[PDB]
Ligand binder design. Structure first.
Ligand SMILES: O=C(NCc1ccc(F)cc1)c1cnn2c1CCCC2
Length: 149
């Protein structure tokens, strides 16, 4: 699959992260990210996708070595970590045709796994609106503990 790039944006307290909500198949909440274009550098794709989805330009803030990368079903997703962005920042996507809403979420309240259905003796996982963000949460919390305190 084609690699994806984006950002995990945190506020100044390091408490909260910015998630975006799409439509249809992308109807839940997830980090801003998207597919890399031909010959485009990872940092440029991340900034591009983040600016298209949030209206916020991370180019002056990206640190090259500060990201979380996950390979999920053979697609690689790398989110650059961008702390310190004020919570009163005005985010607006380029078009409401792709992005429904943009919100801050408390990191400590976000799930870092989906719940099974053991109550009902049924296999699998219950739906969770944070399903695209979930795989990054534990690695983010571990990364913040290491790199900050
Ligand atoms: O990325 C997602 N959500 C946030 C988002 C990011 C960019 C955007 F333009 C709109 C919403 C998402 C949700 N479900 N799927 C995805 C991606 C691929 C697998 C299905």
């Amino acid at each position: 699959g084609v690699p994806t790039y984006g950002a995990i944006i945190l506020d100044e307290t390091l408490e909260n992260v910015l998630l975006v909500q799409g439509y249809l198949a992308k109807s839940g909440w997830g980090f801003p990210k998207g597919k890399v274009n031909k010959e485009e550098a990872p940092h440029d794709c991340a900034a591009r996708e983040v600016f298209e989805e949030t209206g916020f330009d991370i180019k002056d803030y990206i640190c090259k070595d500060d990201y979380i990368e996950l390979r999920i079903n053979d697609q690689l997703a790398r989110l650059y970590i961008i702390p310190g962005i004020p919570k009163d920042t005005k985010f607006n996507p380029k078009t409401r045709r792709e992005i429904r809403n943009i919100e801050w979420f408390s990191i400590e309240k976000l799930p870092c796994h989906r719940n099974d259905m053991t109550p009902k003796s049924k296999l699998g996982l219950a739906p969770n609106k944070f399903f695209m963000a979930i795989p990054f949460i534990r690695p983010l919390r571990d990364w913040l503990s290491r790199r900050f305190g």
